[PDB]
Symmetry: C2
Subunit: 77 residues, 2 copies
């Protein structure tokens, strides 16, 4: 469909692309955290550690907002 | 552009919607990388600790591939 001046289809159109993009991101968040929370890592002058019992809170909320805010932008469009 | 059943127009479209998505994702990743790379943070049973001097890599590289991955899906669709 179109909200203006932008029209987006993979079709039946706007809902279906956006819904797929929303899922693919949410899945990427969960995986990236899961491996990260196992992970402790250093390469060159950069070093990164994540450790958990369970609750992947900081990155997942921030990225989920960022994608959802893009979704609100894509649908305003 | 259209590849199909998909057609995506913001108008003028093609390179422009896609360029804009690469740009905002890149900026988002840099913001997370600087603030976090100073950070050490614990909330609930989940704790994430990040240290920098030069470089941004693991987080950076996976995020950049995700930008690419959407780009390829769009090019294809």
């Amino acid at each position: 469909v179109s909200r203006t001046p932008m029209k987006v289809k993979v079709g039946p159109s706007s809902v279906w692309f956006v819904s797929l993009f929303i899922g693919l991101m949410l899945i990427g968040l969960i995986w990236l955290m899961v491996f990260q929370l196992a992970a402790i890592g250093s390469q060159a002058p950069t070093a990164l550690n994540w450790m958990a019992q369970l609750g992947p809170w900081n990155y997942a909320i921030a990225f989920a907002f960022m994608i959802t805010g893009l979704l609100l932008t894509m649908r305003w469009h």
